[PDB]
Amino acid sequence: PIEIPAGVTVTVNGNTVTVKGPKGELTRTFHPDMTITVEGNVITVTRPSDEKHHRALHGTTRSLLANMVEGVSKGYEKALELVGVGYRASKQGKKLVLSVGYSHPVEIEPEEGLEIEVPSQTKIIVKGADKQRVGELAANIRAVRPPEPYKGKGIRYEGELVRL
Amino acid sequence: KVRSSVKKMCDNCKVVRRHGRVLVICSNVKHKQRQ
Amino acid sequence: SIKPTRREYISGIPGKGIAQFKMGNNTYPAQVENVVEKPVQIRHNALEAARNAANRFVQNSGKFRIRKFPFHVIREQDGDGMRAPFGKSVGTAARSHGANHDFIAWVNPDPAVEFAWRRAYMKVTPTVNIDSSPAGNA
Amino acid sequence: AEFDADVIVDARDCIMGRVASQVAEQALDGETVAVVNAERAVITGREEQIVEKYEKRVDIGNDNGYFYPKRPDGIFKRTIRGMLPKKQRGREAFESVRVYLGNPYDTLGEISETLGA
Amino acid sequence: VQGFAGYKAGMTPREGMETVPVTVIETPPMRAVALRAYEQRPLTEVWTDEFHSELDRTLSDRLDHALDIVEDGGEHAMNIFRAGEYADVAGVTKGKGTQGPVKRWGVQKRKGKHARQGWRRRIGNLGPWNPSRVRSTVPQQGQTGYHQRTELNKRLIDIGEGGPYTLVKGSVPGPDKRLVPFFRAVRPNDQ
RNA sequence: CAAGUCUGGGCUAAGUGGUAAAGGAUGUGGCGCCGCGAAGACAGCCAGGAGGUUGGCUUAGAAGCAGCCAUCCUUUAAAGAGUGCGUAAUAGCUCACUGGUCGAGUGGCGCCGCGCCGAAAAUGAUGCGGGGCUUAAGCCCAGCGCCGAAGCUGCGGGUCUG
RNA sequence: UCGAUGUCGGCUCGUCGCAUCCUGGGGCUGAAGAAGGUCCCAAGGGUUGGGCUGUUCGCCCAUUAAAGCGGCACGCGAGCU
RNA sequence: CCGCUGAAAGCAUCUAAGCGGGAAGCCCGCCCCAAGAUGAGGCCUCCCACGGCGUCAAGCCGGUAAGGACCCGGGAAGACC
């Protein structure tokens, strides 16, 4: 059960749904073994199961679709901490230059859709037209440049913790 | 861990299902329950 | 279901050396309890242990009355090889008759005990059934 | 290349079981079948273990031999022969049963693909 | 003909800076012979005679530049192989024959109290009782001398034309001189 | 390889079927209980996260958050004999307590029928094989007809005993 | 199996297998490092000379990354010993 | 073994469905055979319809050096072949 905000263009067919609007031009997949509720202003959970099982199925589709939404409307931004007294990172080329010892630093690229931002050398983030892929590659780096909690330092998903 | 006889620890250690598999997840390494 | 020689003749009339029948406490209502449903020459020692085990985990009220007792005996190896069997004796046990009134945890309201027997339970040897008697337990 | 039209057959979505079975019965009676589709026909869910069994075919490789086709082509081949008899009649029948990739003439892609498409 | 080839001159080594051995190889440009291509239907090899004068006594890079000189009109000098690079080369064995478990294959034979005792060479055994009969394992006396042999990382250093000839690093060309050796350069690690 | 990819009503989604025990675990599917949603209910969220409680052995530190013994009182929104992360005891969070928002079904234990971990193996693999996942088929209960012995009848002949 | 299957140890040739010694990949520590320990996944390849002992095994010598368990009639006598 | 994305549990969950992270391992890659893989594979080069007999004469004769073969002469090719 959800609405379909401004410019929310929702094409339901094949079993995919092209979903286009602002800094959100998207086209996603939405199962053919259940049922679609799309209606000019809002949208919702059909019930081609009505039973606990596929139940989960479309509660999920609720969230998903929702995604096509908020997404295609106002994109996605994941807040990344670069905490490294020594470890440091900044934009360079059309990619991210991060440095964490080892020797070589790394150029990471956010292919079509993925965009990385170096607000300020110490904190870094990722905005991508969509939560899925975003959070995804995002963490990709977030583990990629070790977060070893031995005693602090590492890339870390915003707001974490210490140790001993 | 023990592979056989997984049974919750921290007062919130989770019985989760991965591959018909009962492994338990908690927020302390001190739990890693894996059958 | 083979058994002992003559209870005054092979090995007959002991004291099955064990650890008696009542620990735990009183009460008029709540029957809290242990019974089983397997069939076997219940393992003297084993049992004895198990049981006192429970005792161990607890100490007082909650009828740890225990309705079992090993009174006959097993035998094997002592003499020439494998053919003609004279008779070495070991294993005093009792026929757990496929389910029955085992040991109780009887009392008004003391779940501490209930759990305890539980303990004694996991303990024991042949699966056994965890239970309540005539009213429930409280 | 091209041929008759005796047994004009194709698959897809089918139950890859009695499909062969008939494949057979016709083969058997004595009817040369030409059929295409591999990929699009089907076989028991639990996709995973499905693939399983079939690579069973895949690496079941012992010194003496034990190939096991890696394309749909085979999948079927094996099944079918699986329904025939090695003696002559069986044999030749086998010559007489012929199917292909998709279309060279007027779940059944997944495990052969997986283990050797 | 996809590749580059010729024969066994001889080995010796001399010079350099420390001193390295090598072998010389024979080959001007043993002419064009069609040109590999599964095009339009099956296309694999043709022979619009342009041949020897004897040969009716018997009657995409590599191959592509091979299109270059092949079209040229037959032959195509060898030495694309330049200033030390790595071909690799095949050479037919050297007919050693049918032999003993020994050199056919390294194996200790007749220890001593009996290494001798009018007793020697003959592999020791075949197969556990109960497993059953005979593997396809343990070689046997497995002839050697006609195998088609060859190797990797074949570093060639230099060449010259006083006749089309090459000097390659570490002979091991397999067979003996006056013999058939082929060289490519493939999957180089010491690329 | 002869005969219903019969039809009927359940349950399986692990190839279980094509061997295993104790023991696991809001898996799934069917049956009984305690507490409420208009003292408008469990997880969300706001919040005070009450005071005499900091009581005894050991204290050197129990003063819930060393362990052995208690488990009362309370002014007042109740109470928390404060199960809980710690530290040298103390010193913060957590619900065992509920307003508004919600707002309509939530948390429980027994009884079950079906199923996954436990359940490592030696020339090579295995439902017999090819095979199959709501007639697949398996597994349960339903009716159905067809298969199949030299066994029983037709067909005809042999034979001994009365 | 007694109208018969030749029982040790060694030899030579080996071939599985995993409960993996060494390897790699893991999660865990009372893990900082480093090196250790706990177990899960994996058998690729690899897994030394003496010494004394008919011995296997074993004890000791010097190495090593290692110096693995066990199957195959405790594999091998129509192959020795 | 570790994540993202997210149901069913309007609050979590790597998670049945969706996507990736990751092994001296598996498949491929390297090299060595190899269509007698009876499913005899490709390609090029070259030789042209001899004879006379009953026929679906797919049976008997010169043949084409298309070619090859025998014998001889020689090979790290090698028991013979």
Side-chain angles (χ1 to χ4, degrees):
Chain A
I2 295 179
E3 46 156 299
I4 244 169
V8 167
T9 163
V10 171
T11 298
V12 205
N13 61 264
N15 46 305
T16 336
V17 178
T18 50
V19 162
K20 284 104 169 183
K23 59 169 175 177
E25 294 172 278
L26 164 164
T27 52
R28 190 190 316 164
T29 61
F30 285 77
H31 44 1
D33 175 71
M34 13 44 59
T35 321
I36 57 193
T37 88
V38 57
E39 308 86 315
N41 43 295
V42 266
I43 16 51
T44 208
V45 191
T46 64
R47 296 312 237 56
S49 185
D50 319 291
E51 28 216 289
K52 60 137 52 182
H53 310 59
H54 313 65
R55 158 173 309 160
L57 197 170
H58 277 353
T60 227
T61 315
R62 291 176 176 166
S63 67
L64 234 177
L65 298 158
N67 309 334
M68 314 190 85
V69 192
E70 260 43 65
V72 180
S73 63
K74 322 166 192 175
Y76 266 95
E77 134 46 16
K78 282 282 180 183
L80 163 290
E81 72 92 297
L82 178 180
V83 181
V85 157
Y87 289 174
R88 316 169 217 191
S90 85
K91 244 286 184 187
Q92 265 163 49
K94 172 52 207 81
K95 295 85 171 303
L96 54 153
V97 172
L98 305 54
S99 226
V100 154
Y102 313 178
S103 85
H104 233 172
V106 178
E107 197 269 43
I108 293 293
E109 124 298 309
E111 176 267 46
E112 184 162 58
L114 1 176
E115 27 304 297
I116 318 139
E117 302 53 39
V118 55
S120 78
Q121 105 85 187
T122 174
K123 46 154 68 183
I124 297 79
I125 30 191
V126 148
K127 282 174 177 173
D130 334 55
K131 29 63 236 314
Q132 184 195 63
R133 320 154 74 190
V134 169
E136 274 106 73
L137 90 175
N140 212 304
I141 229 63
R142 274 199 147 160
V144 174
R145 314 233 201 183
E148 319 175 11
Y150 287 80
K151 42 59 183 181
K153 186 190 187 196
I155 17 200
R156 311 174 156 152
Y157 324 68
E158 249 4 276
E160 304 319 334
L161 56 192
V162 196
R163 291 295 69 96
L164 207 301
Chain B
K1 250 77 306 86
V2 189
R3 203 215 307 181
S4 72
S5 83
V6 127
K7 271 119 262 189
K8 274 152 178 151
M9 286 320 288
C10 60
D11 297 300
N12 341 299
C13 280
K14 286 182 172 174
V15 186
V16 198
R17 323 190 144 242
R18 61 184 65 194
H19 303 48
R21 291 192 166 179
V22 173
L23 304 205
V24 192
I25 329 181
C26 197
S27 50
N28 253 296
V29 196
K30 284 300 162 178
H31 293 110
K32 297 302 180 171
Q33 239 180 68
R34 179 188 276 145
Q35 298 167 186
Chain C
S1 307
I2 98 176
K3 297 304 178 176
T5 277
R6 268 232 69 300
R7 0 298 183 196
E8 323 161 357
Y9 301 46
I10 5 162
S11 50
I13 310 142
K16 74 186 165 181
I18 314 194
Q20 298 211 310
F21 258 41
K22 80 108 236 314
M23 176 50 253
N25 205 271
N26 216 81
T27 290
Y28 307 90
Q31 311 165 34
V32 190
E33 60 289 79
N34 121 57
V35 140
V36 198
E37 49 336 73
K38 265 290 186 162
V40 94
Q41 303 86 338
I42 306 312
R43 268 301 182 197
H44 70 110
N45 40 193
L47 343 175
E48 320 182 312
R51 272 195 171 181
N52 291 302
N55 99 233
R56 311 156 200 159
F57 307 63
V58 227
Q59 305 162 61
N60 57 283
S61 153
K63 266 204 160 186
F64 282 64
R65 260 203 295 161
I66 39 59
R67 301 164 180 182
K68 257 299 178 185
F69 16 50
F71 295 48
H72 64 336
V73 281
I74 346 184
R75 172 265 267 197
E76 51 308 286
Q77 188 160 269
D78 166 11
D80 307 304
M82 195 302 313
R83 317 177 197 187
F86 277 101
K88 222 180 171 181
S89 62
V90 241
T92 293
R95 190 160 204 173
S96 43
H97 91 168
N100 77 281
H101 273 81
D102 199 38
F103 328 135
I104 305 181
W106 224 77
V107 155
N108 303 293
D110 173 357
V113 165
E114 117 62 270
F115 325 138
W117 240 186
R118 143 260 196 160
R119 310 178 184 175
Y121 269 100
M122 319 280 256
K123 153 47 240 161
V124 311
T125 94
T127 30
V128 183
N129 183 198
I130 321 96
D131 35 52
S132 303
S133 227
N137 158 294
Chain D
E2 131 77 19
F3 327 79
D4 26 294
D6 211 271
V7 190
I8 299 177
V9 205
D10 72 309
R12 300 155 195 288
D13 286 301
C14 27
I15 189 180
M16 209 22 70
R18 321 71 154 258
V19 162
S21 83
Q22 287 202 293
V23 160
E25 329 276 291
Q26 286 311 308
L28 252 178
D29 291 354
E31 286 193 62
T32 77
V33 190
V35 184
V36 246
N37 290 16
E39 38 282 282
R40 192 189 307 162
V42 189
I43 280 180
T44 14
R46 319 236 189 165
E47 318 172 287
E48 317 136 309
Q49 311 166 342
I50 210 77
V51 211
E52 286 194 82
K53 336 296 179 171
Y54 266 47
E55 276 139 73
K56 287 239 178 183
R57 297 320 174 162
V58 137
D59 27 298
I60 292 165
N62 314 290
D63 281 67
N64 235 303
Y66 275 82
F67 310 120
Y68 290 72
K70 289 153 199 165
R71 296 40 157 301
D73 343 358
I75 280 178
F76 301 18
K77 313 302 182 190
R78 287 296 142 181
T79 79
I80 46 175
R81 317 221 169 181
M83 308 272 229
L84 306 99
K86 197 248 294 181
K87 273 191 181 192
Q88 167 181 194
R89 282 192 186 172
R91 301 216 189 180
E92 310 209 278
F94 303 65
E95 313 181 75
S96 261
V97 143
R98 304 189 200 171
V99 182
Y100 314 71
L101 39 180
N103 331 293
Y105 305 88
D106 260 51
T107 82
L108 235 56
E110 206 169 277
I111 306 341
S112 140
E113 181 199 313
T114 48
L115 36 283
Chain E
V1 196
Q2 185 130 25
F4 327 88
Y7 278 42
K8 294 230 169 195
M11 49 213 261
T12 99
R14 314 209 174 191
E15 50 39 58
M17 201 309 126
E18 318 169 312
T19 33
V20 158
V22 152
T23 359
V24 281
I25 300 296
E26 56 279 22
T27 352
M30 300 274 318
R31 287 161 139 175
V33 290
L35 278 163
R36 279 307 122 103
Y38 326 84
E39 346 103 310
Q40 290 184 61
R41 266 180 159 192
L43 263 180
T44 52
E45 352 93 77
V46 187
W47 320 88
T48 65
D49 283 50
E50 282 149 47
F51 318 166
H52 270 90
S53 103
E54 319 175 298
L55 311 184
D56 235 284
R57 277 176 183 171
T58 305
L59 187 302
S60 180
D61 289 294
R62 318 281 163 150
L63 334 61
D64 226 66
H65 267 66
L67 324 192
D68 278 66
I69 319 172
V70 153
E71 288 187 51
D72 286 18
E75 51 202 276
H76 11 57
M78 274 186 227
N79 65 285
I80 254 196
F81 284 23
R82 358 173 144 198
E85 295 179 293
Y86 287 62
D88 246 54
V89 184
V92 211
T93 30
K94 300 156 145 187
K96 202 165 291 184
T98 76
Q99 172 242 122
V102 227
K103 19 161 175 298
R104 306 221 102 164
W105 305 51
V107 183
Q108 203 185 65
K109 343 145 59 170
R110 320 65 206 18
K111 284 273 207 197
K113 255 163 291 309
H114 314 35
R116 341 78 180 195
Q117 309 179 325
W119 260 68
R120 303 161 156 297
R121 321 138 163 159
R122 286 151 303 172
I123 270 273
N125 215 314
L126 280 317
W129 301 100
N130 290 185
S132 178
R133 299 171 127 194
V134 173
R135 313 197 189 250
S136 85
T137 59
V138 176
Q140 262 319 287
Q141 320 198 275
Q143 287 175 308
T144 83
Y146 339 167
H147 307 60
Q148 295 186 250
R149 313 183 139 182
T150 165
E151 4 134 39
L152 313 181
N153 47 268
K154 293 189 172 147
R155 34 167 39 199
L156 189 171
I157 341 67
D158 20 31
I159 283 179
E161 288 207 305
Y165 289 148
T166 97
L167 268 175
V168 191
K169 328 192 208 273
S171 167
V172 195
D176 329 71
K177 313 169 192 172
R178 295 197 193 177
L179 295 171
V180 218
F182 299 55
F183 42 92
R184 299 142 214 179
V186 194
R187 287 208 142 187
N189 182 335
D190 211 81
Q191 290 184 60

